[PDB]
């Protein structure tokens, strides 16, 4: 496993799902709910096979959260950052589509960040590909501490996004354990 210098990590969770999930006798004991999640994850995967997103590499799916890294170049020089943002919006456009036929109002919460990461595989039994590094942590932290229908990015990230054409608003200060307090911004739409 090698180490990259500039990889854009993104997290798009759905905090509204956990409540949606319910193991009742009628829905096959939570089985039906998962079916809806399948139509969600799948719907989000149909984007990976799209020209403009040929650079987006889905890493994994944490529960009901989507994780994709843009910048691994496999499996401007910082343009992959803006692309990742376009993938975030892309997900939104599809989550809302689901609601249309689902009757829900599922809102996506995205936290994007970029920086050095260590891509590779771990686990002897069934080897799996995953990335490591402080970069991913901050990204995640900007998802668990974000806002529905909003993308939370750090300073350095906000700056680059602006050089790309995006406007950002300072949310305030967020605390990331082991890193203290940081200043995040919301990508204006």
């Amino acid at each position: 496993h090698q180490s990259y210098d500039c990889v854009c990590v993104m997290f798009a969770s759905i905090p509204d799902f956990k409540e949606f999930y319910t193991e009742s006798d009628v829905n096959k004991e939570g089985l039906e709910c998962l079916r809806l999640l399948n139509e969600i994850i799948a719907d989000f995967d149909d984007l990976l096979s799209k020209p403009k997103f040929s650079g987006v590499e889905k890493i994994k799916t944490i529960g009901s959260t989507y994780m994709a890294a843009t910048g691994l170049s496999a499996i401007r020089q910082y343009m992959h950052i803006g692309t990742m943002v376009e993938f975030a919006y892309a997900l939104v456009g599809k989550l809302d589509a689901i609601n249309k036929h689902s009757f829900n109002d599922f809102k996506l919460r995205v936290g994007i960040n970029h920086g050095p990461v260590i891509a590779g595989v771990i686990g002897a039994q069934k080897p799996q590909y995953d990335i490591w590094g402080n970069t991913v942590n901050v990204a995640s932290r900007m998802d668990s501490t974000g806002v529905l229908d909003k993308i939370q990015v750090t300073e350095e990230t906000s700056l680059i996004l602006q050089t790309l054409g995006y406007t950002c608003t300072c949310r305030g200060i967020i605390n990331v354990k082991g890193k203290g307090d940081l200043k995040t911004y919301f990508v204006n739409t």
């Binding site: 999930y21 079916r35 994850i41 799948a42 995967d45 994994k60 082991g178």
Partner: protein, 190 residues
């Protein structure tokens, strides 16, 4: 075929779910290099994946510094309860060797629970054998509201254990707001 996408998921009962997390990982994460960690990380779970096969526990997924295998899969086993306990048992000394060569205060927080679950895969890209069930969510919180170098089991995991292990009050309520909100009685393997 048509309408919806074939969901590759199957229901299961009488299984034990064990969650484990590195207590204070940022502790050494601020000491060891970004790479040294990934090594220790890969080194630890390595032994884990092997111990699991020895204790008959199936590896589910690795989340950073969180590792969780479930017993009773694929082939049903009425020994599931012990399998996880056994896992947590050996798992610990595996994270202790992390004190010898690296960061101190490194211990595992085992959180075991039993009940039905839903295993399989979602979406249609880079499938990841995962589980879904409130029982699974409970094991998670159990792990969260656990104690260093100790095993945190619920009331269900204790019944499936035929009381072959000596336990004690867990007080998970005053630990996790979930084990509290749901009025859950927790114990700790002595």
């Amino acid at each position: 075929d048509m309408m919806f996408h074939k969901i590759y998921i199957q229901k299961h009962d009488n299984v034990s779910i064990l969650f484990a997390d590195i207590e204070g990982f940022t502790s050494l994460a601020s000491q060891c290099t970004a790479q040294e960690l990934v090594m220790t990380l890969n080194e630890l779970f390595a032994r884990f994946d092997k111990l699991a096969a020895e204790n008959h526990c199936l590896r589910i997924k690795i989340l950073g510094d969180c590792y969780y295998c479930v017993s009773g899969l694929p082939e049903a086993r009425a020994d599931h309860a012990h399998c996880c306990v056994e896992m947590g048992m050996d798992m610990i000394e595996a994270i202790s060797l992390v004190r010898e060569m690296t960061g101190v205060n490194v211990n595992m927080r085992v959180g075991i629970h039993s009940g039905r679950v839903h295993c399989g895969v979602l979406g249609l890209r880079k499938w990841q054998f995962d589980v879904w069930s409130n029982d699974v969510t409970l094991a998670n919180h159990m792990e969260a509201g656990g104690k260093a170098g100790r095993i945190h089991i619920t009331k269900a995991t204790l019944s499936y254990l035929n009381g072959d292990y000596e336990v004690e009050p867990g007080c998970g309520g005053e630990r996790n707001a979930y084990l509290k909100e749901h009025s859950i009685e927790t114990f700790l393997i002595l």
